Amino acid sequence: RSLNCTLRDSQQKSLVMSGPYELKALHLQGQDMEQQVVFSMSFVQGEESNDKIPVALGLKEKNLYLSCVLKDDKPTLQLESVDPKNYPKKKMEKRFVFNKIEINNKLEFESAQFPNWYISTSQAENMPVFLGGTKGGQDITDFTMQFVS
């Protein structure tokens, strides 16, 4: 099972492609909202609970999936090139698995490979989307989902 969506942070910044494997978060006005990245959210096998739901986040219009890997021995968010013929899988590789958390009517995406690290945005305009360890501080970890047809 899969669904197409757009994700916006709690400060209402939209997510856009910034490079071949880079995403940035910025406020987009009116007609420019068509620029927001379309995500392919797949429900994968893993640790299930009332608080956490395992998901895989693909770029839908790209052969890319959000991945968590060690870069300079620090958990880092990346966009990994994949073969669309083989993806989405029911049993997805750990690095691609995210725990979808429902907070106060908002969504959180925790890394399964690196627990307590979340998909994050800066408070600042036009900064890269990254994996952040802090929850309830500098980094924004809360998101709103908008379904696309």
């Epitope: 856009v16 492609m17 071949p20 068509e34 839908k60 219009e61 790209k62």
Partner: antibody, heavy 118, light 108 residues
Framework: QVQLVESGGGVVQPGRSLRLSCAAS????????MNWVRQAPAKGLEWVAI????????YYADSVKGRFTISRDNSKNTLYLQMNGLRAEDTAVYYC???????????WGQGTLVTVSS | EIVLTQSPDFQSVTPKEKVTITCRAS??????LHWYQQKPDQSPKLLIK???QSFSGVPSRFSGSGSGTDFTLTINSLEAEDAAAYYC?????????FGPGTKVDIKR
């Protein structure tokens, strides 16, 4: 609404350089990716280069990589193409093109002809 | 790079009839396949975006279909003005590539 106007096309000797520019209007230039697409006389379309909205990242076709440079000026709504080490095979109409979500080329300019010969 | 094979290179079709042109990708591109029309002495124009979505201002007679490697552009009720070149382009991965093109001849 959307308008893309190319300039700088003309004659350039093989091995020499030429700089193209594209004036954009009728949309928020600073939030859209810009591209160069070329077409040799009586031939098909070939994607040259892309520059993302903020100008931080660029990507090139294998045929132009290391010779051509794509740049933009968001304060002047202009896209540029710096073409160096030009060869006869580079003769083409060079189109300025906007992309939607780094996907389809939704708006195109009128194109500018670059003739590479002696 | 992903190689796009466009079939046929040329097609002569009776007016008011259907034209079917295929685009084949060397690797799976999902739904990131776009269609363009180029009329003589004109710049190319977007027809179909993301395999099946008609672009703003494009008539209903132009339709797109496909996923993965095989993609089709269908022109229902063929008109004289449709005598042009048609191109497929993939945006799934970099470098972006185009198919070699198809020329459509109207059989009068």
């Amino acid at each position: 609404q959307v308008q893309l106007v190319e300039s700088g096309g003309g004659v350039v000797q093989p091995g020499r350089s030429l700089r193209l520019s594209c004036a954009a209007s009728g949309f928020t230039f600073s939030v859209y990716g810009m591209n160069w697409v070329r077409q040799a006389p009586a031939k098909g379309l070939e994607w040259v280069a892309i520059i993302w909205y903020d100008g931080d990242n660029q990507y090139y076709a294998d045929s132009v990589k290391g010779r051509f440079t794509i740049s933009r000026d968001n304060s002047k709504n202009t896209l540029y193409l710096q073409m160096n080490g030009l060869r006869a095979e580079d003769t083409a109409v060079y189109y300025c093109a906007r992309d939607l979500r780094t996907g389809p080329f939704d708006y195109w300019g009128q194109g500018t002809l670059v003739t590479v010969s002696s | 790079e992903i190689v796009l094979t466009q079939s046929p290179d040329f097609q002569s079709v009776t007016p008011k009839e259907k034209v079917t042109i295929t685009c084949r990708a060397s690797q799976s591109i999902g739904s990131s396949l776009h269609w363009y029309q180029q009329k003589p002495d004109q710049s190319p124009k977007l027809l179909i975006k993301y395999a099946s979505q008609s672009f703003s201002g494009v008539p209903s007679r132009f339709s797109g279909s496909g996923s993965g490697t095989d993609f089709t552009l269908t022109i229902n009720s063929l008109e004289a003005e449709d005598a042009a070149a048609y191109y497929c382009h993939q945006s799934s991965s970099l470098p972006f590539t185009f198919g070699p093109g198809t020329k459509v001849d109207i059989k009068r």
